[PDB]
Amino acid sequence: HWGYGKHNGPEHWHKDFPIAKGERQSPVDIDTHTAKYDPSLKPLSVSYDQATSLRILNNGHAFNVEFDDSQDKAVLKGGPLDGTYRLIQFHFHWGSLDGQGSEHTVDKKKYAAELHLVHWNTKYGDFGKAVQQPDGLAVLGIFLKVGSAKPGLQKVVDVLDSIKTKGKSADFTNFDPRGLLPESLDYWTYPGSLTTPPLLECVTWIVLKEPISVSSEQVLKFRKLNFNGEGEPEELMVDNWRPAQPLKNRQIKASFK
Ligand SMILES: O=C(O)Cc1cccc([N+](=O)[O-])c1
Ligand SMILES: [Zn+2]
Description:
Number of helices: 4
Strand content: 25-35%
Protein name: Carbonic anhydrase 2
Shape: globular
Largest sheet: 13 strands, mixed
Domain Alpha-carbonic anhydrase: 1-256
Organism: Homo sapiens
Distance between the termini: 44 Å
Keywords: Acetylation, Cell membrane, Cytoplasm, Disease variant, Lyase, Membrane, Metal-binding, Osteopetrosis, Phosphoprotein, Zinc
Bound molecules: 2-(3-nitrophenyl)acetic acid, zinc ion
């Protein structure tokens, strides 16, 4: 099955998921000089005051912080979006070293990590139906750089020891994702895909310009996770990022001047 190695990594995914070579794949490089300011874009509305996290999961590819998405409790709206998109989970992608890890790049710059807050369009009723639609998901992507610690991330880092290996979960209630957001909500947006199989072309991407800062210690704890299951040969969970894919016939739009 797919993963991030030599033998099963991104460069192989097309064999089981031919949409890997599609017209609207993600991530992409954001060429800041060619992304045009679009005055018709709105401010993003991130409403996470009632978000109800339930659990954290090592799925063997990353870890997921999961939310109760059975009511409109944590929603993303506005920005480039029509309608209302409910938060279901967040996760990250990161590197073996601070010089890589992000999926999107900015003028070819790779950040140490990238956070993805995944939301589904309520007009499709559930996640599984939403991923079948071109406007089914909105993913908010936030870059991480290494510097000052992010106090709001620490709760997540400290639970990771309990989900070291693939298939482990742990209760993770009352975590507030507002603590992961940067000051500005300036963004780039473009139409794209999931960045892991099945790579479905169902995402409006909203990538924030301003990274968050996390400490070296925090990211080092991400890198102590394992791709393998309990008791199997240890292979550190690092470099779980898909590289930039061809932009093809897409425009990246900027919310800011
Ligand atoms: O489980 C998976 O890898 C598929 C999946 C599910 C939800 C979000 C995703 N994304 O690319 O942001 C991908
Ligand atoms: Zn992701």
